[PDB]
Amino acid sequence: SSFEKVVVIDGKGHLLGRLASIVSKQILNGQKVVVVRCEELNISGEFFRNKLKYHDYLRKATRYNKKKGPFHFRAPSRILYKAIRGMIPHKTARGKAALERLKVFEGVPPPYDKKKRVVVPQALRVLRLKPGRKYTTVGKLSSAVGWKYESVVEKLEEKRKVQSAEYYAKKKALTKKLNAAKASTAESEAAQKLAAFGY
Template sequence: MREFIVDAKGHLKGRLASYTAKLLLKGEHVTIVRCEEANISGNIRRNQLKFAAYLHKTMRTNPLRGHRHYRAPSQMIKKAIRGMLPHKSPRGAAAFGRLKTYDGVPTIYEKKKKLVIPDALRVQRLQARAKYTRLGDLAVAVGWGYAGIIGKLEKERLARGKAYHSKKQLDKKVKDAIWEEKQCTKNAVLTKKGKRRENAIKKLVDKLKKTKKGKKGANNKKDGKDKKEEEKEDKKTDNKEKKTDKKEKKDVKEDKKEKTDKKEKGEKNKNPFSPPDLHRPYHYKVAKKTQQAGTEYKD
């Protein structure tokens, strides 16, 4: 199953306990870190009095078997969650076994994502003017002696996180700067190429303009001669075309005459009154065909 790592900072203890108990009974693994930063509604003096009253709850005959009054914030939250679970049944015991609570943030969970339960936040549940107590302060007032060590470790952790974040930001800036430099160099190269190309085009245009101007002056003198020569050439081409047309017409007429002559000759050679070969025997027809092919027929 999934593991929910909850940061207890700014959460109300009872609300946090109820939501975590529900998750545990559903079969989820829940880990709560920074339990000393959780809150309890009410003034610190009021909470101290309540805790003092809670300390009187013991077993008179054998206090070791009675209530265990935990001073550590992580154990306080754990006991609150246990009270919301059926911890004596197998299901409740299994759910309670899936719970972990820590003061501060262990190194295992430093770089892991922490979650928040919005409905359990003090900002959501308490009014702005309402008084509240930090669980770590109450624990120190009651007798918890590890607040200094946890505070020191938390400062070191925050310093490491800050250094990591600043390094990450610096790396990002360096990458962005390198990318910008590359883009600038590309743009510079492109602009240089573009300028060179523009200059080359301008030079070509200027040359073309000069050559056109020079040709105009020379061509104006030759225009009269060129026109006469062009007219003569046009006349020659027209005469040639006319001659070719006449020749083609003559050839067409001659072809028609030849065709008509051939047709007339073929009609004259034919005997229109020759009887058909239908009454002749078969071998006669074969003989005739063979004679036409240039072979002799023999019965």
């Protein structure tokens, strides 16, 4: 709702098309969007069905010159980018500027690893899919169709998770003392007046 300077979306557990449509409408309206962890996106349907769909996508190429044809990008970020570009008037100057407002990555590279990542409830797989339905992870599909850097991404991701865990341990230690201090300053004249106001 609020006009944010940059919106960083943790792409884990999101459905490809619904997130793509929401992000398309966001970036068309002048909002800068960065999606991280694109290999953690989800597509409804079993893995084999989506692999067959991507193989149908691969079969389409320009007959007279394979270099002129559709370019089938295998990286998960590029799969999300293809889905988003399908929902943008990308052949106009306005659509070009809107696509200039978008960034998509695998993992969480700098500087976005030290920023706040949000989610989109309208596109979250756990909130959208019926609990028994099968789904596919975009990282596995990308590896199955030719993406090469899954292991590097997972190694860098576990390194970043170790760093973030140390950060969160420090932050939780600091917050704990602040909560104790505010309790000491509770039941004081400022604290009593603030409670009657709703704070």
